[PDB]
Design an enzyme around this catalytic site. Structure first.
Site, PDB file in Angstrom:
ATOM      1  N   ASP A 153       7.427   1.981   8.923  1.00 49.25           N
ATOM      2  CA  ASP A 153       6.312   1.887   7.993  1.00 49.25           C
ATOM      3  C   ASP A 153       5.276   2.986   8.160  1.00 49.25           C
ATOM      4  OD1 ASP A 153       4.471   1.112   6.245  1.00 49.25           O
ATOM      5  OD2 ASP A 153       4.134  -0.904   7.104  1.00 49.25           O
ATOM      6  N   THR A 154       5.384   4.048   7.348  1.00 53.63           N
ATOM      7  CA  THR A 154       4.440   5.155   7.412  1.00 53.63           C
ATOM      8  C   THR A 154       3.046   4.748   6.980  1.00 53.63           C
ATOM      9  OG1 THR A 154       5.092   5.885   5.188  1.00 53.63           O
ATOM     10  CG2 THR A 154       6.273   6.845   7.055  1.00 53.63           C
ATOM     11  N   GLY A 155       2.936   3.658   6.240  1.00 53.76           N
ATOM     12  CA  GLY A 155       1.661   3.122   5.802  1.00 53.76           C
ATOM     13  C   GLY A 155       1.005   2.196   6.804  1.00 53.76           C
TER      14      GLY A 155
HETATM   15  C1  LIG Z   1       3.675  -6.430   6.466  1.00 54.70           C
HETATM   16  C2  LIG Z   1       4.307  -6.232   5.108  1.00 54.70           C
HETATM   17  C3  LIG Z   1       5.141  -4.983   4.991  1.00 54.70           C
HETATM   18  C4  LIG Z   1       4.365  -3.721   5.293  1.00 54.70           C
HETATM   19  C5  LIG Z   1       3.171  -3.423   4.380  1.00 54.70           C
HETATM   20  C6  LIG Z   1       2.545  -2.072   4.716  1.00 54.70           C
HETATM   21  N1  LIG Z   1       1.419  -1.765   3.890  1.00 54.70           N
HETATM   22  C7  LIG Z   1       0.238  -1.080   4.457  1.00 54.70           C
HETATM   23  C8  LIG Z   1      -0.817  -0.933   3.387  1.00 54.70           C
HETATM   24  C9  LIG Z   1      -2.017  -0.077   3.667  1.00 54.70           C
HETATM   25  C10 LIG Z   1      -3.251  -0.911   3.968  1.00 54.70           C
HETATM   26  C11 LIG Z   1      -3.654  -1.846   2.854  1.00 54.70           C
HETATM   27  C12 LIG Z   1      -0.389  -1.879   5.564  1.00 54.70           C
HETATM   28  O1  LIG Z   1      -0.560  -3.108   5.469  1.00 54.70           O
HETATM   29  N2  LIG Z   1      -0.816  -1.213   6.617  1.00 54.70           N
HETATM   30  C13 LIG Z   1      -1.499  -1.877   7.725  1.00 54.70           C
HETATM   31  C14 LIG Z   1      -0.533  -2.398   8.754  1.00 54.70           C
HETATM   32  C15 LIG Z   1      -1.171  -3.009   9.978  1.00 54.70           C
HETATM   33  C16 LIG Z   1      -1.530  -2.006  11.057  1.00 54.70           C
HETATM   34  N3  LIG Z   1      -2.548  -2.287  11.843  1.00 54.70           N
HETATM   35  O2  LIG Z   1      -0.908  -0.985  11.155  1.00 54.70           O
HETATM   36  C17 LIG Z   1      -2.537  -0.901   8.275  1.00 54.70           C
HETATM   37  O3  LIG Z   1      -2.241   0.267   8.548  1.00 54.70           O
HETATM   38  N4  LIG Z   1      -3.705  -1.429   8.577  1.00 54.70           N
HETATM   39  C18 LIG Z   1      -4.795  -0.664   9.106  1.00 54.70           C
HETATM   40  C19 LIG Z   1      -5.948  -0.598   8.120  1.00 54.70           C
HETATM   41  C20 LIG Z   1      -5.621   0.197   6.892  1.00 54.70           C
HETATM   42  C21 LIG Z   1      -6.696   0.058   5.846  1.00 54.70           C
HETATM   43  N5  LIG Z   1      -6.596   1.190   4.908  1.00 54.70           N
HETATM   44  C22 LIG Z   1      -7.486   1.477   4.001  1.00 54.70           C
HETATM   45  N6  LIG Z   1      -8.527   0.648   3.861  1.00 54.70           N
HETATM   46  N7  LIG Z   1      -7.353   2.547   3.214  1.00 54.70           N
HETATM   47  C23 LIG Z   1      -5.318  -1.354  10.366  1.00 54.70           C
HETATM   48  N8  LIG Z   1      -5.616  -0.495  11.422  1.00 54.70           N
HETATM   49  O4  LIG Z   1      -5.502  -2.567  10.433  1.00 54.70           O
HETATM   50  N9  LIG Z   1       3.595  -3.540   2.991  1.00 54.70           N
HETATM   51  C24 LIG Z   1       2.936  -4.171   2.089  1.00 54.70           C
HETATM   52  O5  LIG Z   1       1.840  -4.705   2.359  1.00 54.70           O
HETATM   53  C25 LIG Z   1       3.540  -4.299   0.718  1.00 54.70           C
HETATM   54  N10 LIG Z   1       4.405  -5.470   0.733  1.00 54.70           N
HETATM   55  C26 LIG Z   1       5.694  -5.391   0.485  1.00 54.70           C
HETATM   56  O6  LIG Z   1       6.278  -4.311   0.254  1.00 54.70           O
HETATM   57  C27 LIG Z   1       6.540  -6.682   0.486  1.00 54.70           C
HETATM   58  N11 LIG Z   1       5.853  -7.839   0.962  1.00 54.70           N
HETATM   59  C28 LIG Z   1       6.080  -8.398   2.156  1.00 54.70           C
HETATM   60  C29 LIG Z   1       5.321  -9.637   2.466  1.00 54.70           C
HETATM   61  O7  LIG Z   1       6.901  -7.897   2.929  1.00 54.70           O
HETATM   62  C30 LIG Z   1       7.065  -6.896  -0.942  1.00 54.70           C
HETATM   63  C31 LIG Z   1       8.056  -8.072  -1.008  1.00 54.70           C
HETATM   64  O8  LIG Z   1       5.953  -7.153  -1.811  1.00 54.70           O
HETATM   65  C32 LIG Z   1       2.466  -4.393  -0.376  1.00 54.70           C
HETATM   66  C33 LIG Z   1       1.679  -3.127  -0.480  1.00 54.70           C
HETATM   67  C34 LIG Z   1       3.033  -4.836  -1.738  1.00 54.70           C
HETATM   68  C35 LIG Z   1       4.005  -3.861  -2.369  1.00 54.70           C
END
Ligand SMILES: CCCC[C@@H](CN[C@@H](CCCC)C(=O)N[C@@H](CCC(N)=O)C(=O)N[C@@H](CCCNC(N)=[NH2+])C(N)=O)NC(=O)[C@@H](NC(=O)[C@@H](NC(C)=O)[C@@H](C)O)[C@@H](C)CC
Lengths: 99, 99
Positions: free
Chosen positions: B25-27
């Site tokens: 997950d690059t995101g």
């Molecule tokens: C866990 C579910 C799978 C991974 C997740 C990664 N998405 C990124 C989105 C970017 C932020 C909104 C993410 O949540 N990143 C987090 C992961 C947790 C982590 N700590 O690494 C992140 O980096 N969070 C940062 C904060 C980023 C905030 N960014 C910002 N405000 N610009 C953090 N340090 O807490 N994917 C998703 O959330 C996507 N979900 C999905 O692709 C699937 N859903 C599920 C439940 O798997 C599909 C069936 O819908 C969303 C976007 C819908 C298409």
């Protein structure tokens, strides 16, 4: 380009006549953009991830330019905390993960 | 490998001697795994996603294999909908996005 992952992989996009910054997210099935207008019909969708679900509007056949590369596909619009380019458009621009 | 994005980029990981599936997950800034037992003390962390914020347990310097590649780093454990390998460990295995 080759994008390393030391920082968040943000790029400039052009969508609906507007420039935005967006995250290249291999963990996202779909592309999700903050509130904006788009043409055509839409239908509602719920999308989930960390923290649960949000409700979005699904627009189809939307042209996007991602870091200079044009891509057409579905775009979801709603109260996302971040603009996200997901796999549905990453495939179209030829993006791969390499290690 | 070169991993295309027509399907979810799921790989096998090994943590605590057990195989699990996780999403590259690059995101994701960080690596987040579903409830399991890890050794040592943990520290609190709040993380955010599409839907809002959740509390997780932070474990540091955890030995983990990702698609056969060895890493040692921070693993967050909590109520994630999916096991995700984020940039903290993607950089350890030399992953890049390319288009
Ligand atoms: C866990 C579910 C799978 C991974 C997740 C990664 N998405 C990124 C989105 C970017 C932020 C909104 C993410 O949540 N990143 C987090 C992961 C947790 C982590 N700590 O690494 C992140 O980096 N969070 C940062 C904060 C980023 C905030 N960014 C910002 N405000 N610009 C953090 N340090 O807490 N994917 C998703 O959330 C996507 N979900 C999905 O692709 C699937 N859903 C599920 C439940 O798997 C599909 C069936 O819908 C969303 C976007 C819908 C298409």
């Amino acid at each position: 380009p080759q994008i390393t992952l030391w920082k968040r992989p943000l790029v400039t996009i052009k969508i609906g006549g507007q420039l935005k910054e967006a995250l290249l997210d291999t963990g996202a099935d779909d592309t999700v953009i903050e509130e904006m207008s788009l043409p055509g019909r839409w239908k509602p969708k719920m999308i989930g991830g960390i923290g649960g679900f949000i409700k979005v509007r699904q627009y189809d056949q939307i042209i996007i330019e991602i870091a200079g590369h044009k891509a057409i596909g579905t775009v979801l619009v709603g109260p996302t905390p971040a603009n996200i380019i997901g796999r549905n458009l990453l495939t179209q621009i030829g993006a791969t993960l390499n290690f």
